[model samples]
Target: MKVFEIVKSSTENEIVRIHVELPRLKYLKDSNFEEKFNSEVEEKIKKFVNEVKGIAQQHTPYEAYVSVDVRYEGKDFLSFVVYYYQFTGGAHGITFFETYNIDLKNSKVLKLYDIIKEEAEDTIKSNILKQIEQNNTDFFPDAPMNILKDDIFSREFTISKDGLIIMYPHYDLAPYASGMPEFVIPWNVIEKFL
Candidate 1:
C-alpha cells in the first residue's frame, strides 16, 4: 500500500537539490478525506520547494538541503517532519520545518491541544524553561513563553514515541550557536497531565 512518491529535483549548478518525502495512510478507510488531506500537505510542500528554488536562483553557489524524518510511526499514530535548510553566503544556513501528526485509530489529524490537556500548558512551558535555565544556552528571558506561544511561526512540534519534542527557529530562544534548540518532554513527565 505505497501512498507517496519521493519527489526529487535540482538546479543545473546543484545549488538547490531536494529529495522530498510525504506519507498518506496506506490502507485508510476514507478516500474522500484522505485525498483532501493529501492535497493540502502537497500544496504546502510545493510552496516550500518553490521558495528554495527561487532563493537558489538568486544566489551564486547557494546550498539548499531538505529532508524528512518519520518521527513516530505506529498502528495508533503517524508523524513526519520536513526540515528545510538554505544559505545565501551567510555565516550559517537557516532552517525551517513543518510536521504532520495523524491519529490512526480516529482517522484524523492532530494538533498540540488535541493531544494535551488545556490546563497542562504551564507544565510544558515550565519544563522548557527549566531546561534552558540549566543549560549554557543564551536564551532570551521569555524564551519558553515565546516558543509555546509561538504564534508567529505556529506551535512547531512532533510527538515522538518517547515524548513530545518542541522545536523553534534559531534565535527564537537563543543565539544561532544553540542550533535550533529542541526539548523533549518525556512521556513519563507529561502523561498524567496529558
Candidate 2:
C-alpha cells in the first residue's frame, strides 16, 4: 500500500505535499502531524537551549547541532496526516504523514488506513479548490467574519471517511456538492497567516 498522488495543483499554486509510504511502515518508523512534530521539536529545541545555556554559563566549550528529519518507517498501519495553508495557487508549508502506522498488524490494515487518509486529504483540497474555482473571490470575501477568522486562507472543513463534508457558517452562493460544503465567502483568501 504505497501513497499515490491524489491531486496535483495545475494552477501553479504550491500545495503542501504529504507522503504516506506503505512499505516504509515495514521499518517500524513513521512521522507525525505538523502540530505534534512542532511540539516535539519545540521541546527538543528547549532542551538544546538549556544545554547551550549551561555551556555558556560555565564557559565550557560546546557546539550545538540540530537536525530535523522526517521519514515514514513503521511495522503497521500508519496514520499519515499532512497540513498546510495555500493561497490562490501558491503554497508555503505542506505536511502529510501516517498518524499511527506502526508494524503492529498485517499489511491488510495498513492498506486500508492508507486509503482512508489519502482520500480524506484529497477531499479537503478538492473542496477548497472547488470553491476557489467557482468565485475565488465570493468564496473568499475581502472583509467578513469568516475571512477574518482564518489567518491563513481563513477557510476550513473536514472530509469524512466516506467523503462526507462539513463546513462552518454557510455564507452565501456556496456550491455544496454531494457531501461537500464550504463557507462560500472570500476573505482576501490570505495565503499564510503571517
Candidate 3:
C-alpha cells in the first residue's frame, strides 16, 4: 500500500539509488496464500537491495527502482504489475516488469497457460507482431518466438480491464532504445482461449 525508497549519492556505499514499491495485504482469510505473495515481495526487495551493492567496493553509480501498479482488480481475479529498472555500470540500463495474476476465489496464482490455451499461442504472437509494427517499434524477427520458447517464469504478463498486457525486458525483444516492449491483446481477440 505504501512505497519504500532508498537513495545514496555520496558515500562509501555502493548503492546510489533504490526505490522499492510493493503492495502489502491486510488481514485476509487466505493466510497461507497471502503469506506466499507477501513473502515473495519481501524476497524481491532483498534481492534488489543486495544487487545494489556495487562490486569492487568502489562505486560510480548503482540504481534500483520499482513501482507497483494495479492493472485490474475484480471479485475473482487480481492483476498487478511491478515495473523495475536497474543500472550498474551499464552503457544504458536494464528494465523489466513483474506481473502477478491471482485467482482470488481459488487462492492460486495464474500462469499464461492457465488463462490462454496452447492453441492460442499463434493468435497472441500475431497480435503482438501487429502491434509492434503499429507502434513503429524495431524488433528482432525471432523475438516473438523467443518469448514462448524461453523459460515459463520469464514470460511475464498481467491482465487489464480491456486487454492482457504482455511484457518483455530490454534487449530481449529489441535494443535498449526500444525500452520494454509491451503488447496488449484485447480480450475479444483471445476470448476463445478463456
* Alpha carbon lDDT of each predicted model: 0.71, 0.32, 0.70
lDDT per residue as tens, model 3, 37-118: 7888768866766666544233366777677878776646778877767777776666667788888778888988787777
Whole-model lDDT for model 3 versus the true structure?
0.70
- Rank by lDDT (best first): 1, 3, 2
Candidate 2 TM-score over all chains jointly: 0.20
The alpha-carbon lDDT assigned to residue 76 of candidate 2 equals: 39
Instruction: Tell me the TM-score of each prediction against the true structure.
Output: 0.78, 0.20, 0.79
The C-alpha stretches of model 2 lying farther than 4 A from their native spots are 1-33, 58-60, 71-194
Worst lDDT 10-window in candidate 1: 1-10
Model 1 over residues 1-194: C-alpha lDDT tens digits? 34433455544455656545554555567677677877877677677777867877645566656666777777567777778776777868888887778886677878887887765566777777788878745787777667467542247788887798877778878888867887787888888867
Q: In angstroms, how far off is 129's CA in candidate 2?
A: 52
Q: Which candidate gets the maximum TM-score versus the true structure?
A: 3
lDDT of 1: 0.71
